Amino acid sequence: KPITPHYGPGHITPDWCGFGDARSDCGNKHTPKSLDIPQELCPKFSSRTGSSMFISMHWNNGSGFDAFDYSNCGVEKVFYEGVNFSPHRNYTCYQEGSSGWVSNKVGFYSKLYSMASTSRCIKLINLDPPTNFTNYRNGTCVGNGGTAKMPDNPQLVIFDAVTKLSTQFVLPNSSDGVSCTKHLVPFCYIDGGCFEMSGVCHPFGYYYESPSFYHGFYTNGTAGLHSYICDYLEMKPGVYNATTFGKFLIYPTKSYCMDTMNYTVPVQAVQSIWSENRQSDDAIGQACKSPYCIFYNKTKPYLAPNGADENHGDEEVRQMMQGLLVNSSCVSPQGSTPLALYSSEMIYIPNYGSCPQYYKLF
Amino acid sequence: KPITPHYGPGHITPDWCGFGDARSDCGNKHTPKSLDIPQELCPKFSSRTGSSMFISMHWNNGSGFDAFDYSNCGVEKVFYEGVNFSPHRNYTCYQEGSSGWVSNKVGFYSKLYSMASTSRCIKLINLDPPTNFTNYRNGTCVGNGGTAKMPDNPQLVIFDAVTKLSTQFVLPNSSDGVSCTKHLVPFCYIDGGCFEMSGVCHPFGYYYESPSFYHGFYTNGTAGLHSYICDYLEMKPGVYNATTFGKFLIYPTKSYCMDTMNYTVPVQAVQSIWSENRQSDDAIGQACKSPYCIFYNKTKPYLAPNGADENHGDEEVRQMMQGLLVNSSCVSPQGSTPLALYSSEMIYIPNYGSCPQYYKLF
């Protein structure tokens, strides 16, 4: 008899892991009512209430951000986080607005997922401070009346006078047992032409460089609307310079350290949103794209009648996450199956394992 | 009885195409002896003797380059070219050497394959010239005694005096029937610190920019070994500027125009090399990576005892290309199969279609 895939994430061997927020964090005081996964699976997730891998990339604890040192290893990976940076947050640093932050978010998650498919371990690490320097200020946001906290990573600095300056930073090749064969590192900038301070409109730009790497940004057009934009870079371990065009410089203070596995396996991501009385975004659906990521979308709103509150304990995702309880043979966008000859519907890519073939063909 | 995959490329529907060189070019005077594909399949390939998609990206006809206006459409794609730019060519423009060109080649093919998996049609097009400008020279190579021809795409220019200048170029949204929903466009530069001309060491750099795009390069370090390096960019149709830091500017003159299909299908690439008495490279194997490309490597040298000459008519690839004669149900790194329940060996990803499962599991 042909088998019907269980819509939702799955795993074909015990070497699998998850990344999450409150909805997979057994440390939460409302556990198990606040969970969207089975409680027996919490030990498989690296998760913290209030956090997301995007938040933790850019911010330390404070000014409204709950940061977490995410760290896990698995050939197979399930991501269920992202919601803790949605338009609901009402954050802007310059004039990019909420949608500017949805764009940064898509950028981050797109790079994370594609890199994670080539990796087994993923670990947020702190970088050593750069070679010392002088006569500078840290950057601030003008957004939200100056209350918006600019990222701690990368760290922007502004020199007291126009200067020539290159400072050195290091991406390590390991972190307490994990090999960092590559790093996900942010590079952010403020576009919109020259940047006005105390009556002088300065060229804005800087770059990362080494003998085998370059990435930079520069503008000196007429001043217009300014936007804080981030690029997410894959960088090898080693020594780099951050270099100024005169007034501005950034250096990274954190990275996601990843190792490399030789067989690429698509990651899985589940739609991470709020209930309908808050502004969510579709950043996860935009970032989780074939062929590197298998997206399990919600077809209903986030509804938690048996949960801790209206934003924690969704029935649909709960049902989806029942899939992680079985030892499957096949993982696909249609969901998971045990070993079987025939499927009740066509299984498409991206998939992996041993997948049943659509019965009507035979 | 379990089926054995035919090692080599394949197709599951008639909507498939190929891209090639002499070894799939029925216009060649030694046809069919010079072919590595069956002759009945020539009408499925966009191919020219002496060319490659990498050559055609950068050069017009002449100075030793045979350029071709590659153009084809297929949900499924087989690439069999690349060899016509190997270290055998002995080309350098600055001091990057042959390996510098292997690196550019990997860059190009990596971007081409990944983009092509999201596209159906791929077409080399000529761009309109940029908005006019004055008091300039075209760049030249110092390599090979000044005999090395610098790419026609992108076109480097050097201004008579330090200047401020932004010029406009256009990536069109169509090309005679094909929708150009995206473009593969090169951006190349010369690294190694400031660039010495007539006693003055100039900062080297420039950028492409629009309100929704930036990509740039800049150096002003002490002069060292200079290398001509290329980045291969995915760009939306529309209007852009090329902008100088003072002395140098590039603008693109060609792109690969691609449309978009909504279901991503991995492309297939076959190892394109010379016989053992010439220097080949493994750029295709480095660029054709899971999950966007299925690489069929040669396990033997290029040997053509029944071919037109020692570089045309390989037995191994000939056998591989027999796969394209059948209407298969499954395409994989193990090769192609018709519809079947069971396989004699495990089928791995990337694959697509309906694939038999490994018999020993049942």
Ligand SMILES: *[C@@H]1O[C@H](CO)[C@@H](O)[C@H](O)[C@H]1NC(C)=O
């Ligand atoms: C943030 O603070 C909490 C305690 O409130 C702690 O559990 C967590 O580890 C802190 N985050 C980081 C990144 O150190």
Ligand SMILES: *[C@@H]1O[C@H](CO)[C@@H](O)[C@H](O)[C@H]1NC(C)=O
């Ligand atoms: C953000 O603004 C929206 C729209 O005004 C508001 O409804 C929402 O509660 C605000 N978010 C926070 C965290 O206060």
Ligand SMILES: *[C@@H]1O[C@H](CO)[C@@H](O)[C@H](O)[C@H]1NC(C)=O
């Ligand atoms: C800038 O930020 C760093 C990292 O947050 C901090 O330790 C340092 O004290 C700040 N420097 C200045 C000059 O405010």
Ligand SMILES: *[C@@H]1O[C@H](CO)[C@@H](O)[C@H](O)[C@H]1NC(C)=O
């Ligand atoms: C940047 O732009 C300003 C204002 O147009 C101009 O006067 C200045 O020369 C520019 N600076 C550089 C380094 O190009």
Ligand SMILES: *[C@@H]1O[C@H](CO)[C@@H](O)[C@H](O)[C@H]1NC(C)=O
């Ligand atoms: C996911 O689902 C919602 C509505 O159910 C839809 O609006 C959104 O576009 C979907 N996104 C993707 C990428 O499927």
Ligand SMILES: *[C@@H]1O[C@H](CO)[C@@H](O)[C@H](O)[C@H]1NC(C)=O
């Ligand atoms: C190069 O020249 C040949 C004739 O020798 C011609 O077939 C080919 O189309 C030319 N290439 C281009 C790109 O026009």
Ligand SMILES: *[C@@H]1O[C@H](CO)[C@@H](O)[C@H](O)[C@H]1NC(C)=O
């Ligand atoms: C390139 O140089 C190699 C090594 O010296 C030589 O054997 C080969 O024939 C040269 N290539 C060409 C096209 O002449």
Ligand SMILES: *[C@@H]1O[C@H](CO)[C@@H](O)[C@H](O)[C@H]1NC(C)=O
């Ligand atoms: C530079 O190259 C273009 C394109 O090849 C050519 O048409 C033009 O005549 C050249 N300009 C100069 C000043 O040599």
Ligand SMILES: *[C@@H]1O[C@H](CO)[C@@H](O)[C@H](O)[C@H]1NC(C)=O
């Ligand atoms: C570039 O470097 C030279 C030589 O070190 C220096 O004198 C010059 O001021 C620099 N130019 C700019 C625009 O920074």
Ligand SMILES: *[C@@H]1O[C@H](CO)[C@@H](O)[C@H](O)[C@H]1NC(C)=O
């Ligand atoms: C392909 O084959 C050759 C030798 O048969 C080997 O040296 C090369 O590394 C191979 N490359 C890949 C990526 O498999």
